[PDB]
Amino acid sequence: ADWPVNDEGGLALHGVNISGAGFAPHITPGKNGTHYFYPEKKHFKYYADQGIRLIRFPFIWERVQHSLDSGLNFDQIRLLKKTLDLAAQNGQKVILDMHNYGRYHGELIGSSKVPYEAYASVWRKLAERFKGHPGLLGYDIMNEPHSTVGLWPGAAQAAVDAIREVDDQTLIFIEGERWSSAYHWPLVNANFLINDPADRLIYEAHLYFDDDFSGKYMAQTSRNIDPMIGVERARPFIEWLQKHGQKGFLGEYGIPDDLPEAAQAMDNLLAYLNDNCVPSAYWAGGPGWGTYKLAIEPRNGKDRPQMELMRKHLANDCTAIGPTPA
Ligand SMILES: OC[C@H]1O[C@@H](O[C@H]2[C@H](O)[C@@H](O)[C@H](O)O[C@@H]2CO)[C@H](O)[C@@H](O)[C@@H]1O
């Protein structure tokens, strides 16, 4: 709905994931500044300066709620509020992403140890904290569910119901099973459907270019990247979206800076996304990435090759989030 817009027209479709509040997730709670990191004004200013108004921001449940019998961590909420504040001051809107893989402290959401009600409450409580914030675009209620033994769809509806008890205005982003793979979407999530009477739900998949779909880009699995593998891995998902009359988001995709074939695949993917008015978020920019080959964070004030590749694709004349249903 209130999707960010570009200055010369169109929508802010193509954004960035920003580190690093979900870093080192096995270390909980860990310490801010050591194990995980939050961005500063420089990051939001840089990406705004590049014409980027969309940000996906991972965090983990374990740092907002250390235990199910505990309330929310005040400082972590304050850190997320700061993130939303700095985004909004720079004309950006943020997707808060609970980067939790269908699990809480390693146990499955929907298991006896982590009931659906515990997930619903945390999202209800989080939505109470951030309801109405100008820099908030919506809630990516779970990153990359996998091996959830049938538990993910019920958990997603429990969180949505709870969120809509307190906030009927924020967008909600729904990922699917099999790590929310875009290529596998029509087979894994063939009959996947969450109920949102607000009509403010978007489905979200991830897509990488290596042979095992993982985005790790190991040497043996990254030797033959077709220039169209990005379009081929997006199309199943887009086609499922069009058939079900639903809106999409490619929440992660990224390439190493040393694979020319990956560059071509990214250019053709973003072009295809634009043709369908489908937004995306590059993985990843922000603090703490060092020389990570996929990182789009500049170094020495030198733009990264992936930022330079993104720029040709920012302009559009879309007025609604797609794809366009049949
Ligand atoms: O990274 C996103 C991407 O993961 C892809 O599959 C991987 C998974 O990421 C990896 O950790 C696991 O061990 O094996 C699989 C093999 O694909 C995944 O298919 C996509 O859903 C996901 O978007």
Q: Where are the domains of the chain?
A: 1-326
Whether the CB-CB separation of 24 and 36 falls below 8 Å is answered with yes
Sign of CA dihedral 210, 37, 91, 324: positive
Is 144 among the catalytic positions?
yes
Identify the residue whose tokens are 């891995």: 233
> Could you tell me which CATH number the domain at 1-326 has?
3.20.20.80
Regarding the beta carbon of 181 and ligand 1, being less than 6 Å apart is answered yes
Report H helices in the chain.
Answer: 41-49, 61-64, 74-89, 116-130, 152-166, 177-180, 185-188, 229-244, 260-275, 305-311
Regarding the beta carbon of 206 and ligand 1, being less than 6 Å apart is answered yes
| Ligand 1 centre distance from Cα of residue 181 (Å) | 7
Q: How was this structure determined?
A: X-ray
SS3 117: helix
Whether the CB-CB separation of 94 and 55 falls below 8 Å is answered with yes
SS3 41: helix
Whether the CB-CB separation of 234 and 269 falls below 8 Å is answered with yes
Q: Give nearest CA residue, ligand 1 atom 3.
A: 214
Whether the CB-CB separation of 63 and 320 falls below 8 Å is answered with no
Is 252 among the catalytic positions?
yes
Alpha carbon separation from 204 to 29, 174, 250 (Å, rounded): 28, 6, 6
Q: How far apart are CA 202 and CA 249, in angstroms?
A: 7
Catalytic option among 62, 144, 175, 297? 144
Regarding the beta carbon of 215 and ligand 1, being less than 6 Å apart is answered yes
Catalytic option among 62, 175, 204, 252? 252
Q: How far apart are CA 310 and CA 79, in angstroms?
A: 29
Q: How far apart are CA 230 and CA 208, in angstroms?
A: 7
Task: Give me the long-range contacts of 69-75 (CB less than 8 A, separation at least 24).
Answer: 71/125, 72/122, 72/125, 72/126, 72/129, 73/29, 75/32
Atom of ligand 1 nearest to the CA of 146: 21
Alpha carbon separation from 55 to 44, 46, 82, 93, 238 (Å, rounded): 9, 12, 14, 6, 21
Atom of ligand 1 nearest to the CA of 180: 21
| Ligand 1 centre distance from Cα of residue 130 (Å) | 30
